[PDB]
Design an enzyme around this catalytic site. Structure first.
Site, PDB file in Angstrom:
ATOM      1  CG  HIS A   1      -1.350  -1.281   1.479  1.00  0.00           C
ATOM      2  ND1 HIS A   1      -1.268  -2.246   2.393  1.00  0.00           N
ATOM      3  CD2 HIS A   1      -2.273  -2.390   0.427  1.00  0.00           C
ATOM      4  CE1 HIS A   1      -1.774  -3.237   2.362  1.00  0.00           C
ATOM      5  NE2 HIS A   1      -2.598  -3.394   1.022  1.00  0.00           N
ATOM      6  CG  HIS A  11       0.840   4.049   4.136  1.00  0.00           C
ATOM      7  ND1 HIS A  11      -0.164   3.955   5.040  1.00  0.00           N
ATOM      8  CD2 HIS A  11       1.551   2.711   4.354  1.00  0.00           C
ATOM      9  CE1 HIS A  11      -0.341   2.703   5.619  1.00  0.00           C
ATOM     10  NE2 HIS A  11       0.666   2.047   5.281  1.00  0.00           N
ATOM     11  CG  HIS A  31      -3.643   0.963   3.243  1.00  0.00           C
ATOM     12  ND1 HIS A  31      -4.471  -0.080   2.748  1.00  0.00           N
ATOM     13  CD2 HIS A  31      -2.774   0.259   4.108  1.00  0.00           C
ATOM     14  CE1 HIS A  31      -4.252  -1.352   3.472  1.00  0.00           C
ATOM     15  NE2 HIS A  31      -3.263  -0.914   4.272  1.00  0.00           N
ATOM     16  CG  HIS A  48      -7.654  -2.767   2.012  1.00  0.00           C
ATOM     17  ND1 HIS A  48      -6.413  -1.965   1.266  1.00  0.00           N
ATOM     18  CD2 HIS A  48      -7.221  -4.042   1.699  1.00  0.00           C
ATOM     19  CE1 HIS A  48      -5.613  -2.873   0.816  1.00  0.00           C
ATOM     20  NE2 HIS A  48      -6.270  -4.252   0.991  1.00  0.00           N
ATOM     21  CG  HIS A  79      -7.630   2.574   0.696  1.00  0.00           C
ATOM     22  ND1 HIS A  79      -7.378   1.510   1.737  1.00  0.00           N
ATOM     23  CD2 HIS A  79      -8.748   2.947   1.407  1.00  0.00           C
ATOM     24  CE1 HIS A  79      -7.889   1.410   2.699  1.00  0.00           C
ATOM     25  NE2 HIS A  79      -8.941   2.510   2.423  1.00  0.00           N
ATOM     26  CG  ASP A 104      -5.501   0.026  -1.247  1.00  0.00           C
ATOM     27  OD1 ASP A 104      -4.551   0.016  -0.233  1.00  0.00           O
ATOM     28  OD2 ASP A 104      -6.538  -0.277  -1.113  1.00  0.00           O
ATOM     29  CG  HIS A 137       0.994  -5.058   5.178  1.00  0.00           C
ATOM     30  ND1 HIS A 137       0.333  -4.634   6.579  1.00  0.00           N
ATOM     31  CD2 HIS A 137       0.748  -4.033   4.388  1.00  0.00           C
ATOM     32  CE1 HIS A 137      -0.328  -3.163   6.130  1.00  0.00           C
ATOM     33  NE2 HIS A 137       0.169  -2.871   5.015  1.00  0.00           N
ATOM     34  NE  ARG A 162       3.022  -0.388   8.672  1.00  0.00           N
ATOM     35  CZ  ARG A 162       2.126   0.493   9.110  1.00  0.00           C
ATOM     36  NH1 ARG A 162       1.637   0.784  10.027  1.00  0.00           N
ATOM     37  NH2 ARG A 162       1.513   1.215   7.931  1.00  0.00           N
TER      38      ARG A 162
END
Ligand SMILES: [Zn+2]
Ligand SMILES: [Zn+2]
Lengths: 153, 153
Positions: A46, A48, A63, A71, A80, A83, A120, A143
């Site tokens: 993602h 941010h 995010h 999401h 998003h 993403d 992630h 993360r």
């Protein structure tokens, strides 16, 4: 034409390289690169809010919602702007990704230049999994590596 | 009034985080933040041309010489148009950064907005101490965490 550069680094064997190939400056982008030091299977991925990722978790939370949705994306429709899919790795420790997209472009101080990407710990649901939280982050887990995005042309 | 946030990582628990603030787009700027995971004593730190820093040398080598210059500054009359001197770390493993400069600014992709940085696990020699490599990089003796420059505005 203009390639951007996202350099994610975690710890020793963990990195994430992604190039962003853009042909003018507001048009759609072809995106590819290798996220290595993973274990096999899917990993959430993602862009941010901001380029801050230096106070550890006291920076990028979930995010960014600049278009005001959940999401999602590779199975959910709302998705998003933060993403760019999920990075699915092989046993040689690497997810080598390939994408093309028209929800971002290499524009200014707010688009995908000056920004942060997160990779992630586990597989991403991409919508609504089994819990509330999956709507926020994809339930993709913790993360590892973090990185910022600048210009490589 | 744009604030930055660079994220360097890779050498496990070593990071290099530096911020900035732009009072006016054409003025001098105060850099701040911290490089942590280091041994105690001096550590060299350099912004390069592009945000390109993915695998290492194929994504940029030394701090670029657009005016065709030597390295240095805080003991030398040259200094590249995209470098700084060195930091020093206290035995908690951290260098404080809180430095001024009157040539970088947060304006355009090639300034510090959009650029890259690497810090080094030894002191820097600033243009000339002993050898070729003093006039080339800055004789900086080792690498550590490398990153791309990010923005929180
Ligand atoms: Zn998302
Ligand atoms: Zn230099």
């Amino acid at each position: 034409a203009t390639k951007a550069v996202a350099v994610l680094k975690g710890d020793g064997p963990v990195q994430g390289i992604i190039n962003f190939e853009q042909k003018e400056s507001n048009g759609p982008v072809k995106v590819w690169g290798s996220i290595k030091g993973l274990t096999e299977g899917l990993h959430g991925f993602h862009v941010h809010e901001f380029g801050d990722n230096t106070a550890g978790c006291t920076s990028a939370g979930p995010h960014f919602n600049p278009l005001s949705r959940k999401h999602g994306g590779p199975k959910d429709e709302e998705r998003h702007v933060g993403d760019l899919g999920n990075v699915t790795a092989d046993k040689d420790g690497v997810a080598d990704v390939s994408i093309e997209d028209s929800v971002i472009s290499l524009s200014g101080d707010h688009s995908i230049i000056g920004r942060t990407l997160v990779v992630h710990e586990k597989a991403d649901d991409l919508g609504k999994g089994g819990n509330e939280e999956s709507t926020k982050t994809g339930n993709a887990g913790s993360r590892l590596a973090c990185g910022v995005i600048g210009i490589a042309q």
